[PDB]
Amino acid sequence: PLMVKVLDAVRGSPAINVAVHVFRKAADDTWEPFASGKTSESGELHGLTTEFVEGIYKVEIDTKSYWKALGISPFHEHAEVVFTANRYTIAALLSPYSYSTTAVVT
Amino acid sequence: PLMVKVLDAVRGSPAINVAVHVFRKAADDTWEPFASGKTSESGELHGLTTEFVEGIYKVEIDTKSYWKALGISPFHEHAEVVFTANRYTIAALLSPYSYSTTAVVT
Amino acid sequence: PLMVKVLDAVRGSPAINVAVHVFRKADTWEPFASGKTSESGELHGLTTEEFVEGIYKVEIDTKSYWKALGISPFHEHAEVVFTANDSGPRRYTIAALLSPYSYSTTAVVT
Amino acid sequence: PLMVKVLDAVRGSPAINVAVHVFRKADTWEPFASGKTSESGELHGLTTEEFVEGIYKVEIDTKSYWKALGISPFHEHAEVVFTANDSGPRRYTIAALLSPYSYSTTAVVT
């Protein structure tokens, strides 16, 4: 039920091999690792979970590493997306000094 | 080779039944109708063309009609995307007073 | 009452010296005003009395901007089309955020 | 040298009274400054000497903003994390453009 999709606004392409880490917020307010992976050649990451109970989740997209691998100076350390779970696609559109993120919930 | 995908940033969903018109620029600088359709339940419009020679194209996405059908006051008349053809996905992310458009060319 | 602001999402900077042409629908597009963005990425003083109700088009010459930086971008231009002043005079800021294969545009109306 | 600007993409307006909390990485997140956006959608005067090199997090409380307008938005907050002043002092504008299920954030560094 959770998928992440990442596009590169500079090249006009999927953002491939972007590392993504998902965390779930614990009772003591810390972030517990939940799942992770890297985007495919289509910029997508499937199969993160099945387990996906209500709670607050954080999806961290490693944008800095991506721009570094392209030789382009980036601004952000990463893009964080934090939401309460209540099909979820977390989309992100990446530029070096800007990004957007959209939840497509169907 | 040309596909249009539209998302609704207010609802977090595909933008369904959005009218899209494609034009090709003529030798006298006018816009000639080329193809059109409406987005599907997945917010996508396929099968616009096959015919898709080099030239300047305009994709008009009827955002105002979409927001009107939702009872939400919009700013723009439409979103226009103009490019030279040289697989093209024209993506758009819609809010009432803002939109983005991204070309995913693969 | 009409201002255009352009930012470069690759550099995190104002987009300087971007040409901007404004048209007003008469059903033809009549030239209305033009200018280029300053060092702040802004273009002021496009109009005044003159900015009556109508459908306006703001064409931002993003391709020339990118080409001058060595980049072959996707779009020919960014066009922003809108009805203005339909409920009396307003101040309009048309913002654009540019990347080689993507742009966003936002209207701030006060 | 740090300013936060927030806009509402549904209304085409400044996002007014949005809470903003800034942290600096010590590996814990230490509270650094906080405030709320004004009628212009801006928050100034967060820092000064004080804004040394470091990793900073700007947390923008978008959910409370939307909830006060009757909306149940997707995100808990918008978080913007960045290294600052790594090559000497700069002016940073952190902009955010909010929709109920989507946001964009941009850095303008001068």
Side-chain angles (χ1 to χ4, degrees):
Chain A
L2 176 69
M3 185 187 118
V4 175
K5 184 182 154 54
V6 187
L7 295 179
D8 175 333
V10 172
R11 293 195 295 163
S13 70
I16 306 163
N17 286 315
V18 177
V20 178
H21 291 78
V22 187
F23 305 86
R24 188 179 184 280
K25 198 168 197 185
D28 61 23
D29 281 349
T30 64
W31 294 102
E32 292 205 335
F34 183 82
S36 60
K38 284 174 300 93
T39 56
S40 73
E41 290 194 58
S42 67
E44 298 189 341
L45 175 56
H46 291 85
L48 288 157
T49 189
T50 57
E51 180 188 47
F52 194 57
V53 296
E54 291 183 316
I56 298 178
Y57 293 86
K58 174 189 306 177
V59 176
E60 183 169 58
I61 300 177
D62 188 357
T63 59
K64 189 181 185 181
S65 295
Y66 177 78
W67 295 115
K68 285 169 51 90
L70 294 179
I72 292 168
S73 283
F75 179 75
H76 303 96
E77 287 300 298
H78 56 260
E80 261 181 47
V81 181
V82 179
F83 63 99
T84 293
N86 199 313
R87 183 179 208 277
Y88 289 67
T89 289
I90 299 303
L93 175 66
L94 304 186
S95 294
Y97 269 65
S98 185
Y99 63 86
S100 64
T101 185
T102 298
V104 190
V105 182
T106 57
Chain B
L2 176 69
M3 185 187 118
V4 175
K5 184 182 154 54
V6 187
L7 295 179
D8 175 333
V10 172
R11 293 195 295 163
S13 70
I16 306 163
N17 286 315
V18 177
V20 178
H21 291 78
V22 187
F23 305 86
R24 188 179 184 280
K25 198 168 197 185
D28 61 23
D29 281 349
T30 64
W31 294 102
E32 292 205 335
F34 183 82
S36 60
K38 284 174 300 93
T39 56
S40 73
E41 290 194 58
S42 67
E44 298 189 341
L45 175 56
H46 291 85
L48 288 157
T49 189
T50 57
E51 180 188 47
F52 194 57
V53 296
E54 291 183 316
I56 298 178
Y57 293 86
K58 174 189 306 177
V59 176
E60 183 169 58
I61 300 177
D62 188 357
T63 59
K64 189 181 185 181
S65 295
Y66 177 78
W67 295 115
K68 285 169 51 90
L70 294 179
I72 292 168
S73 283
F75 179 75
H76 303 96
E77 287 300 298
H78 56 260
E80 261 181 47
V81 181
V82 179
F83 63 99
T84 293
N86 199 313
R87 183 179 208 277
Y88 289 67
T89 289
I90 299 303
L93 175 66
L94 304 186
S95 294
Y97 269 65
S98 185
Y99 63 86
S100 64
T101 185
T102 298
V104 190
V105 182
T106 57
Chain C
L2 179 62
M3 74 165 268
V4 177
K5 174 174 164 64
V6 189
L7 295 178
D8 177 324
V10 172
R11 301 165 167 69
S13 69
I16 299 171
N17 198 213
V18 175
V20 176
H21 293 254
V22 186
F23 305 85
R24 183 182 175 277
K25 206 159 191 211
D27 208 68
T28 177
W29 289 110
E30 294 188 326
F32 184 77
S34 70
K36 51 152 231 172
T37 58
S38 69
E39 305 281 295
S40 67
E42 304 184 357
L43 172 56
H44 291 84
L46 284 169
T47 189
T48 57
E49 290 96 325
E50 184 179 52
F51 194 38
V52 292
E53 287 202 26
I55 298 171
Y56 292 86
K57 176 188 290 180
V58 174
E59 184 165 54
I60 299 172
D61 181 11
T62 56
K63 184 177 176 188
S64 298
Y65 176 81
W66 290 115
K67 283 288 190 177
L69 296 169
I71 297 295
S72 290
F74 184 78
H75 301 93
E76 288 295 306
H77 57 254
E79 209 180 285
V80 181
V81 184
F82 59 101
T83 294
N85 309 303
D86 41 313
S87 58
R90 301 285 192 280
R91 197 174 79 186
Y92 294 87
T93 291
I94 305 300
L97 175 67
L98 306 186
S99 304
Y101 275 67
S102 182
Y103 63 86
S104 172
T105 187
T106 297
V108 185
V109 184
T110 57
Chain D
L2 179 62
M3 74 165 268
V4 177
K5 174 174 164 64
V6 189
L7 295 178
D8 177 324
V10 172
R11 301 165 167 69
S13 69
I16 299 171
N17 198 213
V18 175
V20 176
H21 293 254
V22 186
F23 305 85
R24 183 182 175 277
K25 206 159 191 211
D27 208 68
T28 177
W29 289 110
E30 294 188 326
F32 184 77
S34 70
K36 51 152 231 172
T37 58
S38 69
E39 305 281 295
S40 67
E42 304 184 357
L43 172 56
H44 291 84
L46 284 169
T47 189
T48 57
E49 290 96 325
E50 184 179 52
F51 194 38
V52 292
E53 287 202 26
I55 298 171
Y56 292 86
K57 176 188 290 180
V58 174
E59 184 165 54
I60 299 172
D61 181 11
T62 56
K63 184 177 176 188
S64 298
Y65 176 81
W66 290 115
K67 283 288 190 177
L69 296 169
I71 298 295
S72 290
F74 184 78
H75 301 93
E76 288 295 306
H77 57 254
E79 209 180 285
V80 181
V81 184
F82 59 101
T83 294
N85 309 303
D86 41 313
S87 58
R90 301 285 192 280
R91 197 174 79 186
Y92 294 87
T93 291
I94 305 300
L97 175 67
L98 306 186
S99 304
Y101 275 67
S102 182
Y103 63 86
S104 172
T105 187
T106 297
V108 185
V109 184
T110 57

Coordinates of all heavy atoms in Angstrom, one line a residue, chain C residues 27-91:
Chain C
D27 N -11.0 38.3 -30.3 CA -10.4 37.1 -29.8 C -8.9 36.9 -30.1 O -8.3 35.9 -29.8 CB -11.2 35.9 -30.3 CG -11.2 34.7 -29.4 OD1 -11.7 34.7 -28.2 OD2 -10.5 33.7 -29.7
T28 N -8.3 38.0 -30.7 CA -6.9 38.0 -30.9 C -6.1 38.4 -29.6 O -6.7 39.1 -28.8 CB -6.6 38.9 -32.1 OG1 -5.2 39.1 -32.4 CG2 -7.0 40.4 -31.8
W29 N -4.8 38.0 -29.5 CA -3.9 38.5 -28.5 C -3.2 39.8 -28.8 O -2.2 39.8 -29.6 CB -2.9 37.4 -28.2 CG -3.4 36.2 -27.5 CD1 -3.6 35.0 -28.0 CD2 -4.0 36.2 -26.2 NE1 -4.1 34.1 -27.1 CE2 -4.4 34.8 -26.0 CE3 -4.1 37.1 -25.1 CZ2 -5.0 34.4 -24.7 CZ3 -4.6 36.7 -23.9 CH2 -5.1 35.3 -23.7
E30 N -3.6 40.8 -28.2 CA -3.0 42.2 -28.5 C -1.8 42.4 -27.5 O -2.0 42.2 -26.3 CB -4.0 43.3 -28.3 CG -5.2 43.2 -29.3 CD -6.1 44.4 -29.2 OE1 -6.3 45.0 -28.1 OE2 -6.6 44.9 -30.3
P31 N -0.7 42.8 -28.1 CA 0.4 43.2 -27.2 C 0.0 44.2 -26.1 O -0.6 45.2 -26.5 CB 1.5 43.7 -28.1 CG 1.2 42.9 -29.4 CD -0.3 42.9 -29.5
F32 N 0.4 44.0 -24.9 CA -0.1 44.9 -23.8 C 1.1 45.5 -23.1 O 1.0 46.7 -22.8 CB -0.9 44.0 -22.8 CG -1.5 44.8 -21.7 CD1 -2.7 45.6 -21.9 CD2 -1.0 44.8 -20.4 CE1 -3.2 46.4 -20.8 CE2 -1.5 45.6 -19.4 CZ -2.7 46.4 -19.6
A33 N 2.2 44.8 -22.8 CA 3.3 45.4 -22.2 C 4.5 44.4 -22.3 O 4.2 43.2 -22.5 CB 3.1 45.6 -20.7
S34 N 5.7 44.8 -22.1 CA 6.8 43.9 -22.0 C 8.0 44.4 -21.2 O 8.0 45.6 -20.9 CB 7.2 43.4 -23.4 OG 7.9 44.5 -24.1
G35 N 8.9 43.6 -20.8 CA 10.1 44.0 -20.0 C 11.0 42.8 -19.8 O 10.8 41.7 -20.3
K36 N 11.9 43.1 -18.9 CA 12.8 41.9 -18.6 C 13.1 42.0 -17.1 O 13.0 43.1 -16.4 CB 14.1 41.9 -19.3 CG 14.8 43.2 -19.3 CD 16.3 43.0 -19.4 CE 17.0 43.8 -18.3 NZ 18.5 43.6 -18.3
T37 N 13.3 40.8 -16.5 CA 13.5 40.8 -15.0 C 14.8 41.5 -14.6 O 15.8 41.4 -15.3 CB 13.4 39.4 -14.4 OG1 14.4 38.6 -15.1 CG2 12.0 38.7 -14.7
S38 N 14.8 42.1 -13.5 CA 15.9 42.8 -12.9 C 16.9 41.8 -12.2 O 16.6 40.6 -12.2 CB 15.4 43.8 -12.0 OG 14.9 43.1 -10.8
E39 N 17.9 42.4 -11.5 CA 18.7 41.6 -10.6 C 18.0 40.9 -9.5 O 18.5 39.9 -9.0 CB 19.9 42.4 -10.1 CG 20.8 43.1 -11.1 CD 21.8 42.2 -11.8 OE1 22.7 41.7 -11.2 OE2 21.7 42.1 -13.1
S40 N 16.8 41.3 -9.1 CA 16.0 40.7 -8.1 C 15.1 39.6 -8.7 O 14.4 38.9 -7.9 CB 15.1 41.7 -7.4 OG 14.2 42.2 -8.3
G41 N 15.2 39.4 -10.0 CA 14.3 38.4 -10.7 C 12.9 39.0 -10.9 O 12.0 38.3 -11.2
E42 N 12.7 40.3 -10.6 CA 11.4 40.9 -10.7 C 11.2 41.9 -11.8 O 12.2 42.5 -12.3 CB 11.0 41.6 -9.4 CG 11.1 40.7 -8.1 CD 10.6 41.3 -6.8 OE1 10.3 42.5 -6.8 OE2 10.6 40.6 -5.8
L43 N 10.0 42.0 -12.3 CA 9.6 43.0 -13.3 C 8.4 43.7 -12.8 O 7.4 43.1 -12.7 CB 9.4 42.3 -14.6 CG 8.8 43.1 -15.8 CD1 9.7 44.3 -16.1 CD2 8.7 42.2 -17.0
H44 N 8.6 45.0 -12.7 CA 7.6 46.0 -12.1 C 7.3 47.0 -13.2 O 8.0 47.1 -14.2 CB 8.2 46.8 -10.9 CG 8.4 45.9 -9.7 ND1 9.5 45.1 -9.5 CD2 7.6 45.8 -8.6 CE1 9.4 44.5 -8.3 NE2 8.3 44.9 -7.8
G45 N 6.2 47.7 -13.0 CA 5.9 48.9 -13.8 C 5.4 48.5 -15.2 O 5.4 49.3 -16.1
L46 N 4.8 47.3 -15.4 CA 4.3 46.8 -16.6 C 3.0 47.6 -17.0 O 2.8 47.9 -18.2 CB 4.0 45.3 -16.6 CG 5.2 44.4 -16.7 CD1 4.8 43.0 -16.4 CD2 5.8 44.5 -18.1
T47 N 2.2 48.0 -16.0 CA 1.0 48.7 -16.3 C 0.6 49.6 -15.2 O 1.3 49.8 -14.2 CB -0.1 47.6 -16.7 OG1 -1.3 48.3 -17.2 CG2 -0.6 46.8 -15.5
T48 N -0.6 50.2 -15.4 CA -1.2 51.1 -14.4 C -2.5 50.6 -14.0 O -3.2 49.9 -14.8 CB -1.3 52.6 -15.0 OG1 -2.1 52.6 -16.2 CG2 0.1 53.1 -15.4
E49 N -5.1 52.5 -14.4 CA -6.1 53.0 -15.4 C -6.1 52.0 -16.6 O -7.2 51.6 -17.1 CB -5.7 54.3 -15.9 CG -5.8 55.5 -14.9 CD -4.6 55.9 -14.1 OE1 -3.7 55.0 -13.8 OE2 -4.4 57.1 -13.9
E50 N -4.9 51.5 -16.9 CA -4.8 50.7 -18.2 C -5.2 49.3 -18.0 O -5.7 48.7 -18.9 CB -3.4 50.8 -18.6 CG -3.2 50.1 -19.9 CD -1.7 50.1 -20.4 OE1 -0.8 49.7 -19.6 OE2 -1.5 50.6 -21.5
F51 N -5.0 48.7 -16.8 CA -5.2 47.3 -16.5 C -6.6 47.0 -16.2 O -7.0 46.8 -15.0 CB -4.3 47.0 -15.3 CG -4.1 45.5 -15.1 CD1 -3.9 44.6 -16.1 CD2 -4.0 45.1 -13.8 CE1 -3.7 43.2 -15.9 CE2 -3.8 43.7 -13.5 CZ -3.7 42.8 -14.5
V52 N -7.4 47.0 -17.2 CA -8.9 46.9 -17.1 C -9.2 45.4 -17.0 O -8.3 44.5 -17.2 CB -9.6 47.5 -18.3 CG1 -9.5 49.1 -18.2 CG2 -9.2 47.0 -19.6
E53 N -10.5 45.0 -16.8 CA -10.9 43.6 -16.8 C -10.6 43.0 -18.1 O -10.6 43.7 -19.2 CB -12.4 43.5 -16.7 CG -13.0 43.8 -15.4 CD -14.3 43.3 -15.1 OE1 -14.7 42.3 -15.7 OE2 -15.0 43.8 -14.2
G54 N -10.2 41.7 -18.2 CA -9.9 41.1 -19.4 C -9.2 39.8 -19.2 O -8.9 39.4 -18.0
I55 N -8.9 39.1 -20.2 CA -8.0 37.9 -20.2 C -6.7 38.3 -20.6 O -6.5 38.9 -21.7 CB -8.6 36.7 -21.1 CG1 -10.0 36.3 -20.6 CG2 -7.7 35.5 -21.1 CD1 -10.8 35.4 -21.4
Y56 N -5.7 38.0 -19.8 CA -4.3 38.4 -20.0 C -3.4 37.1 -20.2 O -3.7 36.1 -19.6 CB -3.8 39.2 -18.9 CG -4.5 40.6 -18.9 CD1 -5.7 40.8 -18.2 CD2 -3.8 41.7 -19.5 CE1 -6.3 42.1 -18.2 CE2 -4.4 43.0 -19.5 CZ -5.6 43.1 -18.8 OH -6.2 44.4 -18.9
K57 N -2.4 37.3 -21.0 CA -1.4 36.2 -21.1 C 0.0 36.8 -20.8 O 0.4 37.8 -21.4 CB -1.4 35.7 -22.5 CG -0.3 34.6 -22.8 CD -0.2 34.3 -24.2 CE -1.4 33.5 -24.7 NZ -1.2 33.2 -26.2
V58 N 0.7 36.2 -19.9 CA 2.0 36.5 -19.5 C 3.0 35.5 -20.1 O 2.9 34.3 -19.7 CB 2.2 36.7 -18.0 CG1 3.7 36.9 -17.6 CG2 1.4 37.8 -17.4
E59 N 3.8 35.8 -21.1 CA 4.7 34.8 -21.7 C 6.1 35.1 -21.2 O 6.6 36.2 -21.4 CB 4.6 35.0 -23.2 CG 5.5 34.0 -24.0 CD 5.1 34.0 -25.5 OE1 5.1 35.1 -26.1 OE2 4.7 32.9 -26.0
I60 N 6.7 34.1 -20.6 CA 8.0 34.3 -20.0 C 9.0 33.5 -20.8 O 8.8 32.3 -21.0 CB 7.9 33.7 -18.5 CG1 6.9 34.5 -17.7 CG2 9.3 33.8 -17.9 CD1 6.6 34.0 -16.3
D61 N 10.0 34.1 -21.3 CA 10.9 33.5 -22.3 C 12.0 32.6 -21.6 O 13.1 33.0 -21.5 CB 11.6 34.5 -23.2 CG 12.5 33.8 -24.3 OD1 12.5 32.6 -24.5 OD2 13.3 34.6 -24.9
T62 N 11.5 31.5 -21.1 CA 12.4 30.6 -20.4 C 13.4 30.0 -21.3 O 14.5 29.7 -20.8 CB 11.6 29.5 -19.7 OG1 10.8 28.8 -20.7 CG2 10.6 30.1 -18.7
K63 N 13.1 29.7 -22.6 CA 14.1 29.0 -23.4 C 15.4 29.9 -23.6 O 16.5 29.4 -23.5 CB 13.5 28.6 -24.7 CG 14.5 27.8 -25.6 CD 13.7 27.4 -26.9 CE 14.7 26.6 -27.8 NZ 14.0 26.4 -29.1
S64 N 15.2 31.2 -23.8 CA 16.4 32.0 -24.0 C 17.2 32.1 -22.8 O 18.4 32.2 -22.8 CB 16.0 33.4 -24.5 OG 15.4 33.4 -25.8
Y65 N 16.5 32.2 -21.6 CA 17.2 32.1 -20.3 C 18.1 31.0 -20.2 O 19.3 31.1 -19.9 CB 16.2 32.2 -19.2 CG 16.8 32.1 -17.8 CD1 17.4 33.2 -17.2 CD2 16.8 30.9 -17.1 CE1 18.0 33.1 -16.0 CE2 17.4 30.7 -15.9 CZ 18.0 31.8 -15.3 OH 18.6 31.8 -14.1
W66 N 17.6 29.8 -20.4 CA 18.4 28.5 -20.3 C 19.4 28.5 -21.3 O 20.6 28.1 -21.0 CB 17.5 27.3 -20.3 CG 16.6 27.1 -19.1 CD1 15.3 27.2 -19.1 CD2 17.0 27.0 -17.8 NE1 14.8 27.0 -17.8 CE2 15.9 26.9 -17.0 CE3 18.3 26.8 -17.2 CZ2 16.0 26.7 -15.6 CZ3 18.3 26.7 -15.8 CH2 17.2 26.6 -15.0
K67 N 19.1 28.8 -22.6 CA 20.1 28.7 -23.6 C 21.4 29.6 -23.3 O 22.5 29.2 -23.7 CB 19.5 29.1 -25.0 CG 18.6 28.1 -25.6 CD 19.4 26.9 -26.2 CE 18.6 25.9 -27.0 NZ 19.5 24.8 -27.6
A68 N 21.2 30.7 -22.7 CA 22.3 31.6 -22.4 C 23.1 31.0 -21.3 O 24.3 31.5 -21.1 CB 21.7 33.0 -22.0
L69 N 22.6 30.0 -20.6 CA 23.4 29.3 -19.5 C 23.9 28.0 -20.1 O 24.4 27.1 -19.3 CB 22.5 29.1 -18.3 CG 22.1 30.4 -17.6 CD1 21.0 30.0 -16.6 CD2 23.3 31.0 -16.9
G70 N 23.8 27.8 -21.4 CA 24.3 26.6 -22.0 C 23.4 25.4 -22.0 O 23.8 24.3 -22.4
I71 N 22.1 25.6 -21.6 CA 21.2 24.5 -21.4 C 20.1 24.5 -22.5 O 19.7 25.6 -22.9 CB 20.5 24.7 -20.0 CG1 21.5 24.6 -18.8 CG2 19.3 23.7 -19.9 CD1 22.1 23.3 -18.7
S72 N 19.8 23.3 -23.0 CA 18.7 23.1 -24.0 C 17.5 22.6 -23.2 O 17.4 21.4 -22.9 CB 19.1 22.1 -25.0 OG 20.2 22.8 -25.8
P73 N 16.6 23.5 -22.9 CA 15.5 23.2 -22.0 C 14.3 22.6 -22.8 O 14.3 22.6 -24.0 CB 15.0 24.5 -21.4 CG 15.2 25.5 -22.5 CD 16.5 25.0 -23.2
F74 N 13.3 22.1 -22.1 CA 12.2 21.5 -22.8 C 11.3 22.5 -23.4 O 10.8 22.3 -24.5 CB 11.5 20.6 -21.8 CG 10.3 19.8 -22.5 CD1 10.6 18.7 -23.3 CD2 9.0 20.3 -22.3 CE1 9.5 18.0 -23.9 CE2 8.0 19.6 -22.9 CZ 8.3 18.5 -23.7
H75 N 10.9 23.5 -22.6 CA 9.8 24.4 -23.0 C 10.3 25.5 -23.8 O 11.4 26.0 -23.6 CB 9.1 24.9 -21.7 CG 8.6 23.9 -20.8 ND1 9.3 23.3 -19.8 CD2 7.4 23.1 -20.9 CE1 8.6 22.3 -19.3 NE2 7.5 22.2 -19.9
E76 N 9.4 25.9 -24.7 CA 9.7 27.2 -25.5 C 9.6 28.4 -24.6 O 10.3 29.4 -24.8 CB 8.7 27.3 -26.7 CG 9.0 26.3 -27.8 CD 10.3 26.5 -28.5 OE1 10.6 27.7 -28.9 OE2 11.1 25.6 -28.4
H77 N 8.6 28.4 -23.7 CA 8.3 29.5 -22.9 C 7.4 29.0 -21.8 O 7.0 27.8 -21.9 CB 7.7 30.7 -23.7 CG 6.5 30.4 -24.4 ND1 6.5 30.3 -25.8 CD2 5.2 30.2 -24.0 CE1 5.2 30.0 -26.2 NE2 4.4 30.0 -25.1
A78 N 7.2 29.8 -20.8 CA 6.1 29.5 -19.8 C 5.0 30.5 -20.1 O 5.4 31.7 -20.1 CB 6.7 29.6 -18.5
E79 N 3.8 30.1 -20.3 CA 2.7 31.1 -20.6 C 1.7 31.0 -19.4 O 1.4 29.9 -19.0 CB 1.9 30.5 -21.8 CG 1.3 31.6 -22.6 CD 0.5 31.0 -23.8 OE1 1.2 30.6 -24.8 OE2 -0.7 31.0 -23.7
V80 N 1.3 32.1 -18.9 CA 0.3 32.2 -17.8 C -0.9 32.9 -18.2 O -0.7 34.1 -18.6 CB 1.0 32.8 -16.6 CG1 0.0 32.9 -15.4 CG2 2.3 32.1 -16.2
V81 N -2.0 32.3 -18.3 CA -3.2 33.0 -18.9 C -4.3 33.0 -17.8 O -4.6 32.0 -17.1 CB -3.8 32.1 -20.1 CG1 -5.0 32.8 -20.8 CG2 -2.6 31.9 -21.2
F82 N -5.0 34.2 -17.7 CA -5.8 34.4 -16.5 C -6.8 35.6 -16.8 O -6.4 36.5 -17.5 CB -5.0 34.7 -15.2 CG -4.2 35.9 -15.3 CD1 -4.5 37.1 -14.7 CD2 -2.9 35.7 -15.8 CE1 -3.6 38.1 -14.7 CE2 -2.0 36.8 -15.9 CZ -2.4 38.0 -15.4
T83 N -7.9 35.5 -16.2 CA -8.8 36.7 -16.2 C -8.4 37.6 -15.0 O -8.2 37.1 -13.9 CB -10.2 36.2 -16.0 OG1 -10.6 35.4 -17.1 CG2 -11.3 37.3 -15.9
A84 N -8.4 38.9 -15.3 CA -8.0 39.8 -14.2 C -9.1 40.8 -14.0 O -9.8 41.2 -15.0 CB -6.7 40.6 -14.7
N85 N -9.2 41.3 -12.8 CA -10.0 42.4 -12.4 C -11.5 42.2 -12.6 O -12.2 43.2 -12.6 CB -9.5 43.7 -13.1 CG -8.0 43.9 -12.9 OD1 -7.5 44.0 -11.8 ND2 -7.3 44.0 -14.0
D86 N -11.9 41.0 -12.6 CA -13.3 40.6 -12.8 C -14.2 41.0 -11.7 O -15.5 41.2 -11.9 CB -13.4 39.1 -13.1 CG -12.5 38.2 -12.2 OD1 -11.3 38.5 -12.0 OD2 -12.9 37.2 -11.6
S87 N -13.7 41.3 -10.5 CA -14.4 41.7 -9.3 C -13.8 43.0 -8.7 O -13.7 43.1 -7.5 CB -14.4 40.6 -8.3 OG -13.1 40.2 -8.0
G88 N -13.4 43.8 -9.6 CA -12.7 45.1 -9.2 C -11.2 44.9 -9.3 O -10.7 43.8 -9.4
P89 N -10.5 46.0 -9.2 CA -9.0 46.0 -9.3 C -8.3 45.1 -8.2 O -8.8 45.2 -7.0 CB -8.6 47.4 -9.1 CG -9.9 48.0 -8.5 CD -11.0 47.4 -9.1
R90 N -7.3 44.4 -8.6 CA -6.5 43.6 -7.6 C -5.0 43.8 -8.0 O -4.8 44.2 -9.2 CB -6.8 42.2 -7.6 CG -8.2 41.8 -7.2 CD -8.5 42.0 -5.7 NE -9.8 41.4 -5.4 CZ -11.0 42.0 -5.5 NH1 -11.0 43.2 -6.1 NH2 -12.1 41.4 -5.2
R91 N -4.1 43.6 -7.1 CA -2.7 43.4 -7.3 C -2.3 42.0 -7.6 O -2.7 41.1 -6.8 CB -1.9 43.9 -6.1 CG -0.5 44.1 -6.2 CD 0.2 44.7 -4.9 NE 0.4 43.7 -4.0 CZ 0.9 43.9 -2.7 NH1 1.1 45.1 -2.3 NH2 1.1 42.9 -1.9

